[PDB]
Design a protein around this ligand. Sequence first.
Ligand SMILES: *[C@@H]1O[C@H](CO)[C@@H](O[C@@H]2O[C@H](CO)[C@@H](O[C@@H]3O[C@H](CO)[C@@H](O)[C@H](O[C@H]4O[C@H](CO)[C@@H](O)[C@H](O)[C@@H]4O)[C@@H]3O)[C@H](O)[C@H]2NC(C)=O)[C@H](O)[C@H]1NC(C)=O
Ligand SMILES: *[C@@H]1O[C@H](CO)[C@@H](O[C@@H]2O[C@H](CO)[C@@H](O[C@@H]3O[C@H](CO)[C@@H](O)[C@H](O)[C@@H]3O)[C@H](O)[C@H]2NC(C)=O)[C@H](O)[C@H]1NC(C)=O
Ligand SMILES: *[C@@H]1O[C@H](CO)[C@@H](O[C@@H]2O[C@H](CO)[C@@H](O[C@@H]3O[C@H](CO)[C@@H](O)[C@H](O)[C@@H]3O)[C@H](O)[C@H]2NC(C)=O)[C@H](O)[C@H]1NC(C)=O
Ligand SMILES: *[C@@H]1O[C@H](CO)[C@@H](O)[C@H](O)[C@H]1NC(C)=O
Ligand SMILES: *[C@@H]1O[C@H](CO)[C@@H](O)[C@H](O)[C@H]1NC(C)=O
Ligand SMILES: *[C@H]1O[C@H](CO)[C@@H](O)[C@H](O)[C@H]1NC(C)=O
Ligand SMILES: *[C@H]1O[C@H](CO)[C@@H](O)[C@H](O)[C@H]1NC(C)=O
Ligand SMILES: *[C@H]1O[C@H](CO)[C@@H](O)[C@H](O)[C@H]1NC(C)=O
Ligand SMILES: *[C@H]1O[C@H](CO)[C@@H](O)[C@H](O)[C@H]1NC(C)=O
Lengths: 328, 328, 328, 175, 175, 175
Amino acid sequence: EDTICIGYHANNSTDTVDTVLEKNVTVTHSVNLLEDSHNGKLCKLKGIAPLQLGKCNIAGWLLGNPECDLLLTASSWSYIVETSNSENGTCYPGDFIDYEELREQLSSVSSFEKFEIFPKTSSWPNHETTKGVTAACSYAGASSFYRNLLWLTKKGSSYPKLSKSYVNNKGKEVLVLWGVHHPPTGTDQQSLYQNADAYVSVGSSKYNRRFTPEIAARPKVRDQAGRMNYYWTLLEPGDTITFEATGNLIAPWYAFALNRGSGSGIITSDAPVHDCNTKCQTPHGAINSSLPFQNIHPVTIGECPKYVRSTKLRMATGLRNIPSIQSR
Amino acid sequence: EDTICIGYHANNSTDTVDTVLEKNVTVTHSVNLLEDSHNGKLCKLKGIAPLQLGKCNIAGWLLGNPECDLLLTASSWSYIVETSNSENGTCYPGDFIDYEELREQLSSVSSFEKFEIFPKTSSWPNHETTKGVTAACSYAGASSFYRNLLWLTKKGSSYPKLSKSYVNNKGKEVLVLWGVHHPPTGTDQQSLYQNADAYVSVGSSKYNRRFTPEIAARPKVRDQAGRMNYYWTLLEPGDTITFEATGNLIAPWYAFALNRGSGSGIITSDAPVHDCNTKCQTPHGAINSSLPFQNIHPVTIGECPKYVRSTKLRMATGLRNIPSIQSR
Amino acid sequence: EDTICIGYHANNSTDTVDTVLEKNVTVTHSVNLLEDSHNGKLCKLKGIAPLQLGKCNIAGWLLGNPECDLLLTASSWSYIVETSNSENGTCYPGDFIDYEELREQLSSVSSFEKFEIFPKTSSWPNHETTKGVTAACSYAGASSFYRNLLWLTKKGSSYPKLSKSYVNNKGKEVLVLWGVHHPPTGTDQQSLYQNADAYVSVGSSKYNRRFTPEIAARPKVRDQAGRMNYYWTLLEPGDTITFEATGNLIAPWYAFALNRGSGSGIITSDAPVHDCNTKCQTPHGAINSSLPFQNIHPVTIGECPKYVRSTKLRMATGLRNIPSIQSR
Amino acid sequence: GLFGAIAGFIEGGWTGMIDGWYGYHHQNEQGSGYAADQKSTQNAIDGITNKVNSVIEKMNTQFTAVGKEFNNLERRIENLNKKVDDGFLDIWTYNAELLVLLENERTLDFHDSNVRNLYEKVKSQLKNNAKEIGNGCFEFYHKCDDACMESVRNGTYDYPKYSEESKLNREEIDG
Amino acid sequence: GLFGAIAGFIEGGWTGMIDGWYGYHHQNEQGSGYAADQKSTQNAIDGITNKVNSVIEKMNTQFTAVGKEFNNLERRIENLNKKVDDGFLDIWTYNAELLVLLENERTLDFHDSNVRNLYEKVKSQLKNNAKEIGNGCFEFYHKCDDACMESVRNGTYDYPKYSEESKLNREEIDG
Amino acid sequence: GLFGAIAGFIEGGWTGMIDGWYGYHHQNEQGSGYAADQKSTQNAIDGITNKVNSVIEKMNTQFTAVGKEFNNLERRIENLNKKVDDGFLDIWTYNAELLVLLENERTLDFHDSNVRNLYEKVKSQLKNNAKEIGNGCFEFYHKCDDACMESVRNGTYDYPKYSEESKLNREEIDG
Ligand SMILES: *[C@@H]1O[C@H](CO)[C@@H](O[C@@H]2O[C@H](CO)[C@@H](O[C@@H]3O[C@H](CO)[C@@H](O)[C@H](O[C@H]4O[C@H](CO)[C@@H](O)[C@H](O)[C@@H]4O)[C@@H]3O)[C@H](O)[C@H]2NC(C)=O)[C@H](O)[C@H]1NC(C)=O
Ligand SMILES: *[C@@H]1O[C@H](CO)[C@@H](O[C@@H]2O[C@H](CO)[C@@H](O[C@@H]3O[C@H](CO)[C@@H](O)[C@H](O)[C@@H]3O)[C@H](O)[C@H]2NC(C)=O)[C@H](O)[C@H]1NC(C)=O
Ligand SMILES: *[C@@H]1O[C@H](CO)[C@@H](O[C@@H]2O[C@H](CO)[C@@H](O[C@@H]3O[C@H](CO)[C@@H](O)[C@H](O)[C@@H]3O)[C@H](O)[C@H]2NC(C)=O)[C@H](O)[C@H]1NC(C)=O
Ligand SMILES: *[C@@H]1O[C@H](CO)[C@@H](O)[C@H](O)[C@H]1NC(C)=O
Ligand SMILES: *[C@@H]1O[C@H](CO)[C@@H](O)[C@H](O)[C@H]1NC(C)=O
Ligand SMILES: *[C@H]1O[C@H](CO)[C@@H](O)[C@H](O)[C@H]1NC(C)=O
Ligand SMILES: *[C@H]1O[C@H](CO)[C@@H](O)[C@H](O)[C@H]1NC(C)=O
Ligand SMILES: *[C@H]1O[C@H](CO)[C@@H](O)[C@H](O)[C@H]1NC(C)=O
Ligand SMILES: *[C@H]1O[C@H](CO)[C@@H](O)[C@H](O)[C@H]1NC(C)=O
């Protein structure tokens, strides 16, 4: 009696998946839909490396903090990486205005170039440039100051109104930073600027703003009762910025010129930066982005898979190894 | 041998859809779930037309910019349309404070009414109203100024403290705009206000704020080294606003009275405004909103379908034209 | 003829559900997926009761508004409840800076403690503390002032520069509040502070800021043409805050010490607070959170089900009572 | 091999949504016939239109909403604002896409199942009195005229009426 | 026409979730019976509870979260904040609704399939020894007593035991 | 009881995705055989790959996006920003989970249906010429050699060729 059965053959498998009706079904094959591991390195996005600030943060690097001088810079970056030891920023106590905004707008830059906007040697014959350092910002044991800014002081019992202006003949935006100093007492006001009732005025064609010394008593920070606020502004290609003051100007020395990028951001990671590429960068490591979901970290940069809090997401495709109750 | 088959008949069709298991199945009928076209016109939402600023933007229109004078206004609007040629705003260089917020709050208005809050003819006998125009805002070839504001100047080697206050006996909110001028030098200060150490103080029951001339050198804009900031505020029905100054007040002349709407917004479109209705408005054109999804533009105003980046979304409802492998 | 039928039995039921293909099918059992009712009380989240301000709001409570004095405080809270009758806040006209931010940061607190930062009796021998009350803030029929702040005035035709500073030896953050007064005229300036050209300077190691009297004419509010702004700041454990002024300081009297919580919020509800627990609190009442969806209120606090605008969401699990066309 | 396409010539036939019908195709002395089954075809039309409506109606949630404008010192909000827009864009596009794809394999199986269910229904009536011959056809073991055919297509076929005739023919036709 | 509602009187019968069961209904010399099939009914109860639990458990993601307050110069953030709220509202409402509707047509088919699958399982045992007579009933070609009935309902019917008796009765009963 | 696991010894057998196949297992004079059905197995492999691809491809929407930083006076934005992050997190987690679980019960039913559909296809050819004996097997009423077996496996079995032989054997074997 010739006989024929129709059924299905299943290969050996340990693969297990879940369905709505059963909790642990052994199928002969599944495809993982979840990205759940990372190479453990900060790679390059858009085929470019991130800016890697070393022992210091964006402020210390933008202003010329001394510790920061030990560091290199390239003409572009995808993103920026601050480490858990980038403590060196604004070494002289004070407030960085719109610090968060600046950090956002510098996250992807195209053609960085630092340049001497107001050369110390020649820009201030009537003011004193030589002196004007502080323990707060010290290099090689001695009192110093920011590499990118310059602390003007009365040349000798006088600080005549100064007025200098840059014009921006570069082809791109210029980021100009300065500071205003707030002595802790009117005596210091005199010692430094010899002008009790002084001011600082800064004017581009898109930026008017006045500044005055908030002379007041305050707690010491890095041994300084005095404070200084650091401001910034983006100068447009044809436009000119003009400074004008009778005291208290931590004048710009070097400015920056750059083309701001689409819109990256900043990652704080102690992982090592390597020369690999990634569509999706995470703080602990880079990840593949061919799968639609991922559980490494929600805070990501790139064309990334969706952060999901799942552990495993196996899509069954195979046959059951233990045949179903239906089939019996 | 009498014989009966059971099967299905399918009508002629070219309609094709996709399923998870097959890529290009011809079915006998499908319903498009995607809105994917637009009439190409800016229609009315809530059965009201949008405010259509012409050759100029909200600032120029709110302040009375001269070019803007060629333009009409109705007592209400659903939203606001700026064109790609609304370049005429704040013709005298300066900053509009909370410009973005004001624009948001005016997007849907109910009963617009412009009124002369401080009539030029009678409000300032001690100050000069006659002179006070600039090339920056010129009409019909001559030097002019904003239609809605007034530039008070020393009547003759004196600017006595002025103090005028409106009371708002209208039944709705009043939007009061003014400005503060910042001469480029102390000589101009004198020429204009004759009061080196002058100020501007503006006070409602919900709004105290002092102003002072930021006298400083700056680049020319539309041939002006001087700047002026334009501020605004919403006066509440019973409340009174009071101005007081010794110089530098671009005083209010006309104010506005209105009931602010739920919450519309602004569209920038060069499409023509027509007298049709829409539940959903998009910048290139209006769309039907009976379907659940739409691929015209993500930036929309109305009760809109969800912007999706799909090309076609056909839901099959018909029979297959080529019978399935299952049915063979 | 022995006979056997296979089929299914369904128990009696009125339960009805919906499916894509039918609108009102009677099944023998369903599980509601929708949370659609609330106990009608403000319970405790994280096993803690909310702060329950009475006839007054956070400003009136933080500053010591008189009406507020009728009220208790505990050392911690999950969230805060303001009622529809918490009208008593800043009784003297003026602006509370970053009022929204402070409110956010105080929504979940751990170890509240109010302390006398600058005792009235001994802190100001050279200034007048005795006088300095107002109709605006009146208690028990007489003119009074905030319980937590102190209005310093010239002791007799003189207000010598004052300078006092707290050091914060508590083990947690200190919230220090003060105010700056703006007299309505220069005469009042003299009457109160005897110092036409006076100022107020407040300095922590993280907080520099100058203040000046904006002397101006304004509408009366609670019978006061004068205004005062109320500022605040969080003092860090080792750090010190230092005040310094020649007029116009509504000095701190009592400050607060606390550990700020993760991140709660504020609910405005006229419901009664009871001693029950909740994972999810809503303004009208608490809800169960074992189900995945809920239609009570979108604005919720806790580990809450998703707000959905559905009316009923019944998942069928039973058998049909009217057998399907398929089965016939 | 289980059921074929009733070779209807291509009529305007039936109602929209499904652009066709479940039916029969007979052959008897009187001649051949094509008849669509009302009760089954109609049920599917109601079901699929109920289905299409849900997919559309249940959305109809949207309310007056928009898009936003910020300044050169508000870059961060602006980008927060985009994160939201794009977030939503990804979510709907993925769901609306999956949802159509998945639900299309469903509608198509649904049709195939109704046709096969109709077959089982006719098999249920005839029993013994006919022979299963493949491709969703039954061969009758008795003379089935247009009236008898109609009673099959409308669920009233009287088995006992033809049992004996069928018996004879089947005993000495097949077997 | 494929299977009926076992006309159980309306007992308290079985366990929640499914409020009923898949079973049999016999008729022999000894008399009539109603028996629910444990192995099949139970599997479905496990399945559907596993299903309801997934739909609930897998949410249980929420964390302490809230709603916000802004001032008269923060109208734009406030509306950005609403866009988010309502965005979510639309998403959940649509998915939770579709999900229940779609997943309900599924549960109902699931039941119908299990009942039919049970029929095919009995058909598998009896074969020859019985006659399919519609409405999900088999007529036996041999005397099937309560013991024999039980062996069917629990998957141990011995075909060969009755093949010969059945052969006789069938040869000269049907055909 | 409807179809079994073709007891293939455990070969490297077929192509990935499905790690197995739909097939036959015969027994005739010449001996026994195991053969997988190409047309049916392959169709499923194409289907399920098409299915796995849709689930992956249709996402591929993401664009350069991120995460944000605020200051001590921006607590409210910061928390608005979390509400967004977590909102999304809950949405995808729930959908990706449900989607896999639901779509996994589907893939598994799909396999079981294809195996049963294959059985109905063989039933369609043989008809009379064989006997259904349970567990997805047919017993032939004629001698079916390897050539005849192949014609079954590839949809070309000639019924009329063996009808008469089968008639005789069946009349006086069963009945
Ligand atoms: C209202 O807005 C309109 C349009 O936005 C604006 O019209 C412009 O007026 C200025 C007057 O200040 C014109 O002068 C310009 O000068 C600048 C800088 O030197 C140039 O960029 C322009 O050069 C082009 O245009 C000239 C004439 O059209 C040509 O002679 C020349 O070849 C250049 O192509 C120009 O000389 C300017 O001409 C117009 N429009 C523009 C943009 O060309 C008007 O001033 C605004 N008025 C108010 C009240 O706000
Ligand atoms: C650049 O960043 C580093 C990293 O924070 C700074 O080094 C630290 O300097 C501080 C402030 O002077 C040191 O504090 C001192 O600690 C000693 C002993 O450890 C203590 O006795 C002193 O009273 C004082 O508080 C600190 O020790 C040192 N590193 C540590 C351990 O944190 C550096 O100051 C920064 N410089 C610039 C230019 O910005
Ligand atoms: C605490 O809050 C209560 C509740 O609002 C306040 O009582 C109210 O005070 C207002 C404001 O000054 C009074 O306004 C006055 O209204 C009367 C008529 O109502 C009118 O004749 C006056 O011209 C004036 O506009 C109001 O009478 C009074 N209402 C109640 C409930 O008695 C109270 O002022 C607040 N006090 C503090 C300490 O903040
Ligand atoms: C858009 O078209 C739909 C579908 O026919 C129609 O019902 C609706 O009224 C239209 N909406 C508009 C543009 O008002
Ligand atoms: C099918 O395979 C058999 C086995 O050799 C052969 O008879 C026949 O020619 C083939 N025909 C088709 C269409 O597969
Ligand atoms: C099946 O299991 C055995 C056990 O050792 C192994 O050798 C064989 O290769 C397995 N097949 C597959 C597909 O891995
Ligand atoms: C699920 O499968 C795994 C591996 O095949 C097994 O170890 C576990 O016990 C299973 N769970 C049950 C019993 O459902
Ligand atoms: C569907 O798309 C294909 C591309 O694979 C197209 O060329 C074909 O004509 C379509 N199917 C039919 C026959 O409509
Ligand atoms: C569904 O049944 C209920 C009563 O059980 C009724 O409200 C409803 O309208 C019924 N379905 C219809 C419209 O046939």
